[PDB]
Each structure stands twice: as C-alpha cells, then as structure tokens.
Ligand SMILES: Nc1ncnc2c1ncn2[C@@H]1O[C@H](COP(=O)(O)OP(=O)(O)O)[C@@H](O)[C@H]1O
C-alpha cells in the first residue's frame with residue numbers, strides 16, 4: 359500500500375591478494391558457492407550477494423548501487439557504506455580510480471547515473487541537487503569543502519532527522535560539477551594531515567547527495583538523501599581501534615536483537631546514520647574482506663557484522679512534500 363518494511367542489504371566483496379600477501383606464505387582461504395555464499399574454515403556465510411576477487415567495479419555497481427539510485431530518484435532515502443578492516447577494499451569499492459571509466463567506483467558511477475536519468479525526463483520534472491562532503495575523525499566533523507570548519511555539530515532538520523549543521527552544500531547541475539567537488543574534497547583532506555595513509559584508515563568519509571525533485575504536472579515534491587560512506591577500519595587493537603566502530607557495532611547489535619533502546623548517540627557517526635540504520639531508508643552495506651589467511655580473524659569478524667546487519671529491517675516510504683493547498687485538496691477527497 360503506502361510504506362513497506364525491508365531488510366538492510368549486505369553484500370560481501372573479496373579482493374584478490376596483494377603483492378605483500380603473496381610474498382609471505384599467505385594462502386587464499388575463501389571458497390565460493392553459488393553467488394551468495396562464501397566458505398571460510400569449512401563454514402558458510404550467505405549474503406544478498408557475494409563478490410569474488412575477479413568481480414569488476416562495474417559488476418558491483420549494477421548489483422548494488424544501480425537499484426539505490428532508482429529509489430532515490432523515486433523520493434526514497436538511500437545509503438551505501440563500505441565496512442571492513444584497513445586494506446580490505448573499502449575505498450576501491452566506493453571510489454576506485456575516480457576518473458577511470460573501467461576503474462571508477464560506486465560514487466562516481468552513481469553520479470553519472472543520476473544525471474543520465476535526469477537528462478532523460480521531460481521538463482515537467484525539476485531536480486535540485488546539492489552535495490556535501492565531510493569526514494568524521496576522532497568523533498569530530500570536518501567539512502572537506504571548507505577545512506576551516508573542523509568541529510561541526512549534528513542537529514535535527516524540520517522533519518526531526520539528524521544532519522551536520524553548517525556544512526557546505528554545493529548546488530550542482532552536471533556530473534562534472536560533482537566530480538570537481540569530489541576532487542576538491544580529496545585535495546583539502548590533506549591539509550593539516552601528517553600521514554594520509556593512517557588518517558584515512560582511522561577516519562570516516564561521507565559524501566552526501568541531497569536530491570529534491572518537483573513535478574509541475576502532479577504538483578508533488580519528492581526528496582531523498584543519498585549517503586555514500588567510506589567507514590574507518592574495523593580492525594581491533596582487544597577492541598575496535600575506532601570507538602565510532604564500536605558504536606556502529608552496538609547499534610547494529612541493538613537493532614538486530616530488537617532492543618527498544620539503540621545507542622545511536624554513542625558517536626555522531628551513528629547519529630548521522632541513525633535513519634539509515636533503523637529508520638526511513640533503503641540501506642546497503644558492502645562488507646569488504648581480504649581472502650588472505652593472515653587476515654582470517656578480522657574477516658570472520660567482518661562476516662559476522664554483515665550477518666547481523668542483514669537481519670535488520672527498516673520501514674521506508676516515499677518522501678513527498680505538499681503545500682497546505684495541495685494537502686487540503688487530498689484531505690478533502692479522502693475525508694469524503
Ligand atoms: N576488489 C579489488 N580488486 C583489485 N584491487 C583491489 C580491490 N580492492 C582493493 N584493492 C586494492 O587494495 C589496496 C587496498 O585498497 P582500499 O580499497 O583503499 O582499502 P581500504 O579502503 O579498505 O583500506 C589498494 O591498492 C586497492 O587498489
């Protein structure tokens with residue numbers, strides 16, 4: 359009818375072994391079945407989809423993000439975030455070779471698709487797309503489009519949904535504008551960072567696409583937020599090196615158990631993704647793993663996080679906006 363309940367989608371992507379791993383006695387320990395199951399230590403883990411090391415960027419996008427883009431275009435909130443220990447393949451998955459047609463990742467592909475669609479519709483559909491690009495490090499938000507603001511606050515919008523107050527919101531009209539924006543952010547992130555390899559492994563990168571469209575015929579306004587997240591490393595020290603990752607794990611556990619209380623507040627990361635996790639949003643998590651034997655423990659660890667998240671259910675619905683005028687017309691036609 360109106361709204362529907364849906365599970366969080368969880369895709370597991372293994373990457374091929376790197377030079378480093380090959381040089382040691384590292385052996386490929388992932389055994390594949392069908393295309394939804396992977397075996398590690400004579401144990402099966404079934405997901406919505408399992409991607410082998412040979413799976414191309416393009417394949418991942420089609421099986422994972424293309425659908426999200428379609429929902430967002432329909433007025434749905436969607437989220438996609440990569441999860442896994444450092445070097446498992448999160449950035450490669452979400453970003454890839456930003457401008458390489460064959461090597462680019464989910465984000466740049468989603469950007470092209472959004473505009474391909476728009477350029478297809480008639481003039482009756484008017485889209486207003488603004489983007490934001492910030493990062494969360496040590497529980498503090500920095501705007502990648504304006505690095506001078508380094509500790510932005512999370513507030514609630516008019517519809518009581520979490521949002522980074524005061525973060526840059528660029529209005530874009532073409533893919534190119536979004537790409538330049540993304541290049542601008544990648545670049546500023548280096549400022550005041552004394553070691554990008556370590557920094558990025560320990561920080562959260564969030565790219566937000568706010569899509570608002572209005573139909574002149576139907577007189578309806580739809581709006582959907584699209585979070586594309588490149589989480590910090592899930593590896594442990596005894597416990598998660600990233601407290602924010604401990605939070606994400608607790609939130610995921612609470613939801614998966616059906617507990618009335620969910621610790622979203624433990625970190626602003628989990629507060630920003632509050633709607634993505636248990637709310638009005640179509641979320642897809644891509645857990646990234648190393649097929650390496652040297653990494654077997656972190657992998658099982660990652661596979662479990664995926665198995666829990668998979669059991670969570672959201673109650674989503676299109677996000678329509680009506681004026682008091684439009685609202686009453688319908689109210690009357692219904693109050694009949
Ligand atoms: N699926 C993959 N296929 C080929 N190379 C990959 C794949 N995933 C990761 N890599 C490579 O592995 C290294 C780890 O990359 P990255 O995605 O940035 O890891 P993470 O973001 O999880 O720390 C990089 O050099 C990257 O290009």
Ligand SMILES: [Mg+2]
Pocket residue numbers: 445448449558559
């Ligand atoms: Mg990374």
